[PDB]
Amino acid sequence: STSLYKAGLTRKFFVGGNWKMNGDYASVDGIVTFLNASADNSSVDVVVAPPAPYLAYAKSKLKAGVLVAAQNCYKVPKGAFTGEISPAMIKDLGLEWVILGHSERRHVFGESDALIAEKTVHALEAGIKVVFCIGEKLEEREAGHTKDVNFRQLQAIVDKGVSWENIVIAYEPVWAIGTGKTASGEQAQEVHEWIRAFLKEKVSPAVADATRIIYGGSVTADNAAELGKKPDIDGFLVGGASLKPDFVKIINARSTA
Amino acid sequence: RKFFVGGNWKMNGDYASVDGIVTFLNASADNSSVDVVVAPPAPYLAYAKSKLKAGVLVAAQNCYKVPKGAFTGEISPAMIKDLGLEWVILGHSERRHVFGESDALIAEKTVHALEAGIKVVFCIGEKLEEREAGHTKDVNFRQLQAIVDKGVSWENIVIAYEPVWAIGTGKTASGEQAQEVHEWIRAFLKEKVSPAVADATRIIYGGSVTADNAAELGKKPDIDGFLVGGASLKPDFVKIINARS
């Protein structure tokens, strides 16, 4: 059940920017410009996810401090899957990150827990790191099933026997995505504590304290500092605000003072 | 109707293998009587566009129904155009049956893509069980009726008939089977749209097309080209492009 003890600050912070279906050469140029000019908050792993057609472009222009990730991928390296990309391609492009299980993939494009778990297992085997997304819908939280949803989504990869060194868990309540309805620091902290409790029992105390757990869902330059006060929130997954200069303010808010 | 040959690389490719394909394609001379389009995986679209001779156009393997928005993992016609491309494959069997894209979603994608000013290779095809049950005509017509219902125009649409049972199995449709379906498709277009559209719309065949059968399939008058998967990854793809030469 939902643990109570707060974690110590023993994990490297993480701030990811998911551009979603946004971007063209000109706008990507603009983003890369403010990202490169930003201070190199070495205390924070910074990752951005451009749409597939702009992955190589972004990597060629970004400073070493900003890593590039794919927004999704499939479960085999090569094959007859029109419209899909694989970890092999991600590696070929010189990238080492991928976002899997994003709310939009699960609820707009119907990706199942099983599929997402298979993708995760394969991506990890390939040597790429994964930002594993989980989260409940408003009706589910109101029915008191926040824990049940997150448990199932996480158990899906535990059952596949994945290792956790290269996994960053992103808790993103569906109701907070692009709605401005940000979870309160308290609400987020309690879910993150529960997630660590889950990891402690399902895996090990070591994994629980080493695994980064970031919050996503209407994170803005104005609430980042406030949310970052919670020891169990190791960073954020940013959507809309990752397309603007405010993304830098969010990174600065998370970095060591 | 000018011959149309498309190469769908599907989820295949890295810089090295893409370079190999670009090499044999660039080595070939252009054929005035054949339009050639290849569809690289999304991460290599720009790379392929910069490396390929002007005679070969690049197409995206899929896209969504809005120009921009919160749809992680999706690309749009706006991006396709920004990349300098003018083609997209929609409704491919793998999207419909492996990733569950509905007839309605595909029709909406098609409407949006055409509105954006890009051309569409609209894919349709029945499964083995549907053909055995006598619904080849029904299934293919239903998939087409979906865009007819949306009121799309057809000047920028190439129809790709690819029976599911013939994809990557080596179980190629015979020339007679394909010709029969393409004739039905034109009848559908002549009735639902117009005689002009029925005669102008290019209908290409896909499903285990190889250098061994392309020449023979190409002799059927209602087949206006091919959509090639596995065979598009090797040099003999050029023999398919020149199927009517």
Side-chain angles (χ1 to χ4, degrees), chain B residues 156-170:
Chain B
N156 289 321
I157 295 176
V158 168
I159 298 176
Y161 170 54
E162 287 194 330
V164 185
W165 46 268
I167 305 178
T169 57

Side-chain angles (χ1 to χ4, degrees), chain A residues 197-212:
Chain A
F198 170 93
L199 290 174
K200 182 175 182 176
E201 297 306 302
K202 296 289 180 179
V203 193
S204 75
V207 173
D209 198 76
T211 305
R212 274 86 68 75

Side-chain angles (χ1 to χ4, degrees), chain B residues 24-167:
Chain B
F24 71 70
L25 282 175
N26 287 357
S28 70
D30 289 326
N31 186 315
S32 298
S33 64
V34 182
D35 285 328
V36 182
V37 178
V38 297
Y44 303 92
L45 293 174
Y47 184 75
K49 177 59 162 51
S50 68
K51 295 299 185 182
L52 289 163
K53 59 179 185 172
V56 180
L57 274 60
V58 176
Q61 288 178 20
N62 187 32
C63 73
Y64 200 47
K65 58 178 183 174
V66 295
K68 54 187 301 183
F71 299 103
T72 297
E74 301 296 302
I75 61 172
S76 66
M79 295 180 185
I80 295 175
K81 299 176 61 180
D82 183 59
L83 298 169
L85 315 176
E86 56 187 63
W87 284 94
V88 70
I89 296 177
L90 292 174
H92 189 278
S93 180
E94 284 136 32
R95 298 316 306 178
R96 296 182 187 263
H97 308 112
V98 174
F99 303 97
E101 293 191 17
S102 71
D103 289 355
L105 171 59
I106 292 169
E108 303 173 327
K109 288 179 173 198
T110 301
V111 171
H112 178 64
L114 296 171
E115 286 176 315
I118 69 171
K119 299 170 184 179
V120 179
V121 169
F122 192 82
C123 306
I124 64 180
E126 85 289 351
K127 300 173 189 174
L128 182 63
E129 178 58 6
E130 302 178 315
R131 167 169 285 265
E132 303 189 319
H135 292 302
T136 294
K137 211 171 184 181
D138 306 81
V139 173
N140 287 287
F141 284 4
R142 170 171 52 68
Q143 301 180 317
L144 288 173
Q145 189 64 54
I147 50 176
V148 165
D149 285 347
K150 293 294 184 177
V152 303
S153 65
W154 301 73
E155 74 287 346
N156 289 321
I157 295 176
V158 168
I159 298 176
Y161 170 54
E162 287 194 330
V164 185
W165 46 268
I167 305 178

Side-chain angles (χ1 to χ4, degrees), chain A residues 18-26 51-56 71-72 74-86 88-90 92-93 99 102 104-105 108-109 115 119 177, chain B residues 8-16 41-46 61-62 64-76 78-80 82-83 89 92 94-95 98-99 105 109 167:
Chain A
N18 178 8
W19 301 356
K20 300 190 179 184
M21 193 174 78
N22 289 281
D24 58 14
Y25 286 121
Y54 300 100
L55 290 172
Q71 287 179 21
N72 190 35
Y74 197 49
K75 61 180 183 177
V76 295
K78 312 162 188 175
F81 300 100
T82 301
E84 300 295 301
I85 67 174
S86 65
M89 292 176 187
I90 294 172
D92 186 58
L93 302 181
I99 298 181
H102 193 278
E104 280 134 39
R105 298 315 305 181
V108 179
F109 302 97
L115 174 58
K119 291 180 169 192
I177 303 177
Chain B
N8 175 13
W9 301 352
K10 302 189 179 181
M11 195 176 72
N12 294 93
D14 43 51
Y15 290 118
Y44 303 92
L45 293 174
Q61 288 178 20
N62 187 32
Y64 200 47
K65 58 178 183 174
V66 295
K68 54 187 301 183
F71 299 103
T72 297
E74 301 296 302
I75 61 172
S76 66
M79 295 180 185
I80 295 175
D82 183 59
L83 298 169
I89 296 177
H92 189 278
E94 284 136 32
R95 298 316 306 178
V98 174
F99 303 97
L105 171 59
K109 288 179 173 198
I167 305 178

